Amino acid sequence: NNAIGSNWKDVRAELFSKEEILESDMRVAIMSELIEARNEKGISQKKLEEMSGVSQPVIARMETGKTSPQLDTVLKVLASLGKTLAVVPL
Template sequence: MTSNAIAGTWDEWEKEHCTPEEIAESDLRVALIGELIRARQERGITQKQLEEMSGVTQPVIARLERGTTSPNVSTLMKVLAPLGKKLAIVPM
């Protein structure tokens, strides 16, 4: 039996198919989503509870955590505030 799988790592594929800007955006998105999920779980808050605290609906929070939506800044600030987090612009 032969395999049709493509050999290599995600990093190799990403470097071959994405621009440095796209890679940076992806890395930032992954870090943001990871921090959001971590902060919610550390506080023992469900997505439904976060909905009640933030005013952002649970389905939107779920899509945000899955990375299937690109939320606007207002939505992010609403979700992060009850988690004790804020968006900041810092030098690179």
């Protein structure tokens, strides 16, 4: 099929450096935890606000935000989900 073109895996490798891909996956991993907490564990975003003690707008900006999210904020949210971050070799 001539209408079915480039695979995203090849496109991503062209448009982004290895560092940009590394940062993206990490942002995706955090998003993935918010998603499958809602999908499986049945936790709402405001339910998460009470467990993690971080405000709902700051949680939402992890997903939709232009920029950050801050490190301590990520650690609070992940911890309430039974997860955390660790320094690991590259």
